[PDB]
Design a protein around this nucleic acid. Structure first.
Ligand SMILES: [Zn+2]
Length: 93
DNA sequence: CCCAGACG
DNA sequence: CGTCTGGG
């Protein structure tokens, strides 16, 4: 049972990192685990976003397999090479 | 004022 | 789904 993760340039300035609970700026690289919001299970499965760094603090709780690296962050390939590199560094080996 | 579309 | 607001 793999977690389903995603990467992308934030679509707007109105989402909030789940790790630090700070607002993510439009345009910034952001990672998501799609899952159920505790306080809103009514919604069911939804995107929960993270600053890449904050995402990594919680790599384990989130269900990230360092064995598969970045391939499991659906949409990685769409990112600029610059960004694809920076990201790949932080991800645990 | 409006409302698509982002978010939770 | 209801809410909010960026960009008309
Ligand atoms: Zn954060």
């Amino acid at each position: 049972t793999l977690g389903d993760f995603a990467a992308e340039y934030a679509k707007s300035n109105r989402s909030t990192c789940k790790g630090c609970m700070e607002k993510i700026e439009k345009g910034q690289v952001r990672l998501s685990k799609k899952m159920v919001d505790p306080e809103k299970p009514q919604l069911g499965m939804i995107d929960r976003w993270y600053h890449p760094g904050c995402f990594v603090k919680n790599r384990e709780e989130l269900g990230f397999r360092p064995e598969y690296s970045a391939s499991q962050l659906k949409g990685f390939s769409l990112l600029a090479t610059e960004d694809k590199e920076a990201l790949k560094k932080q991800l645990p080996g």
